[PDB]
Design a protein around this ligand. Structure first.
Ligand SMILES: O=S1(=O)C[C@H](NCc2cccnc2)[C@@H](O)C1
Length: 291
């Protein structure tokens, strides 16, 4: 699967909020472009002169994420974060010359990402009470991955001693994205677990944190809540459900060629971290069928 690479696979079936540290530092920002950031300003002016209702927004930037030695006590993950924007995204990751900016970063800084905005996404593998994952169909009229399958999520906007507030906002944001798009009550959702981090190579390597969330509603009830918002309550054009049993072999199905890269990330991490039993009981052939 060339369009998605794993940056992080969490241990212990996934990491809760209280085991994660963040360092939000201007040392983690994008480096100014070799010829100057005027080139980002020029793409933005052109875009606003066609679509003057567009507005900029701040984003978190992923620099790096370091996992503690497995089985250790204390914080298990450090996320190194800076700040970027929708505008810096449009002028770098989304630019036609994005591959040239990756080569320049390798040459200048020993870092393919040094000249890229790399805004941090969040996504969820959202399971129902009746053991299904939730999928959404993307509109055919949006700029990115039109008409493809997605999972719930988005790209949080800002606002360990500011770090903990930043971790809280990331975990809060995946639940808020589920309530905004799927139309579920907050109180039907578990606290998220972080499964890992996946990179979208079709979007010059920008990363998404992938989370596991359990809902107390059945697939039937989740569908009712989604539809009862009406065509204006969501950006997606449809919702559908796959049995957790069947997610295990999803990369062998015709669905796989219709998943956008960040949703492929979420399903691979679900399969490795929540799937893939290690013990004798869930390992036994009748519960883990071979092939
Ligand atoms: O947070 S972002 O900068 C906003 C962006 N939205 C999709 C999009 C794509 C191309 C042009 N406009 C919007 C995220 O994919 C990254």
């Amino acid at each position: 699967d060339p369009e998605v690479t794993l940056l992080l696979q969490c241990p212990g079936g996934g990491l809760p909020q209280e085991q994660i540290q963040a360092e939000l530092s201007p040392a983690h920002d994008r480096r100014p472009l070799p010829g100057g950031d005027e080139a980002i300003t020029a793409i933005w002016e052109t875009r606003l002169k066609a679509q003057p209702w567009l507005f900029d927004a701040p984003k978190f930037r992923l620099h790096s994420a370091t996992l503690a030695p497995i089985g250790s006590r204390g914080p298990q993950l450090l996320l190194r974060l800076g700040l970027t924007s929708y505008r810096d995204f449009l002028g770098t990751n989304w630019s036609s010359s994005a591959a040239w900016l990756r080569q320049q970063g390798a040459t200048d800084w020993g870092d393919t990402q040094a000249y890229l905005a790399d805004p941090l996404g969040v996504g969820a593998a959202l399971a129902t009470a009746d053991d299904f994952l939730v999928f959404l169909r993307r509109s055919r009229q949006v700029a990115e991955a039109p008409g493809l399958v997605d999972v719930p999520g988005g790209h949080p906007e800002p606002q360990d001693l500011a770090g903990q507030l930043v971790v809280h906002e990331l975990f809060s944001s995946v639940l808020q994205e589920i309530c905004d798009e799927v139309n579920l009550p907050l109180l039907t959702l578990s606290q998220p677990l972080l499964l890992g981090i996946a990179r979208n190579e079709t979007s010059a390597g920008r990363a998404s944190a992938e989370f596991y969330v359990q809902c107390s509603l059945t697939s039937e009830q989740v569908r009712k809540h989604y539809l009862s918002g009406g065509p204006e309550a969501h950006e997606s054009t449809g919702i559908f459900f796959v049995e957790t049993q069947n997610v295990r072999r999803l990369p062998e199905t015709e669905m796989w060629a219709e998943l956008c890269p960040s949703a492929k990330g979420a399903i691979i991490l679900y399969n490795r971290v929540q799937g893939s039993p290690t013990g004798a009981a869930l390992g036994s052939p009748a519960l883990l069928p071979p092939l």
